[PDB]
Amino acid sequence: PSDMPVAHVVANPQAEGQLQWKNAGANALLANGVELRDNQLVVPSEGLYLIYSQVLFSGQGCPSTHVLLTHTISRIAVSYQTPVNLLSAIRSPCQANPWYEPIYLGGVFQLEPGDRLSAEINRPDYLDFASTGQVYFGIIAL
């Protein structure tokens, strides 16, 4: 019955210094057409999708005078190997006790069959996949 194309994938903990999504964990979804290919979610159908993502950024101190953390959801159309941002957010973590920066991305978008979605970051060397629930990427057809 729960037959709408859907995905809720999480970061792999054993994958050191990389944001690589997996259909693993007690509560992860890759269902009703959606695929995880080349670290990307493949859209099986045309329609309105709710898409979202969260990354937890962590670090011990502030090494450089200034560092910028970004979180992006981009779209690649089937014959168009050139990604295009749908959601994007930026945080400056600083202007030695640890810091934390969760970044939530969320929106409703018109998607086409075969579109690839990536949830990317610039600083995987600051990712914190240290616990369940902290790093996720999901989509649902509406």
Place this chain on the structure above:
Amino acid sequence: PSDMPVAHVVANPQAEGQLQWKNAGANALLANGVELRDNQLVVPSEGLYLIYSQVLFSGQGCPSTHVLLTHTISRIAVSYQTPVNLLSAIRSPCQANPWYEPIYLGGVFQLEPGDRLSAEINRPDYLDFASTGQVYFGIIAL
């Protein structure tokens, strides 16, 4: 309202040192079979749910001691199994300055009838209620 199991509860400002969810004053829902019991959302039927919650912490200055501020949503399927973190994020107020730190969690989960969803912070003494819509917890069957 409609046909689908739906909830949008908010923190009770009269609740001393406890995050207390209530269905109170309109612009809040709790309908189509969803119950609020023992501070937790109880789901009535199998299905894919969008699940989301927000908390806002704040302080007048930075605590003499380093504090981690967390927020998490957990699936409680049965008394004998340990709750599973669906959505979790950490914040740290400090590396007399007023500070505000929102945590937003939101994801799509397959659930079963009777599942209990809890939305819980580690530290209640840093919750902010100074405005109306800063602390909320909700779900909708999709």
Place this chain on the structure above:
Amino acid sequence: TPSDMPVAHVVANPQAEGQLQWKNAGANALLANGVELRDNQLVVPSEGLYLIYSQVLFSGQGCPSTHVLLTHTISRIAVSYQTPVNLLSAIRSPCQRETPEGAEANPWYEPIYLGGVFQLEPGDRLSAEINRPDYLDFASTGQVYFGIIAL
């Protein structure tokens, strides 16, 4: 526009530093199925459960003080009662220290994401508003948006 459901996804219009003005334009924009954009608000055409959401991005150059505050607020202007009532609100604070005088000024950035579900009446008006539009980052698509969908 594949589904018949009321749907919006409007973005910020950058034209002069000033205001957070919503516009139905860009490669990601949507205004369908009765939903209207009027007096800088989303107008709802029917009764139903709507997922409402927005993201704003603030940016500044260094910290004039320690009490710069950044607010974002989705409000409901109901046909039943016509005054802005908060549905979703959050506050951020970019500045832990003042940037000392003559010190290289550093760029800061703070996102706020608001998202939640609400029963809306036909003719209800929704706004997504900030306190410091002088701190709004703009410009690029995918950073500052406001959206709704009938579930």
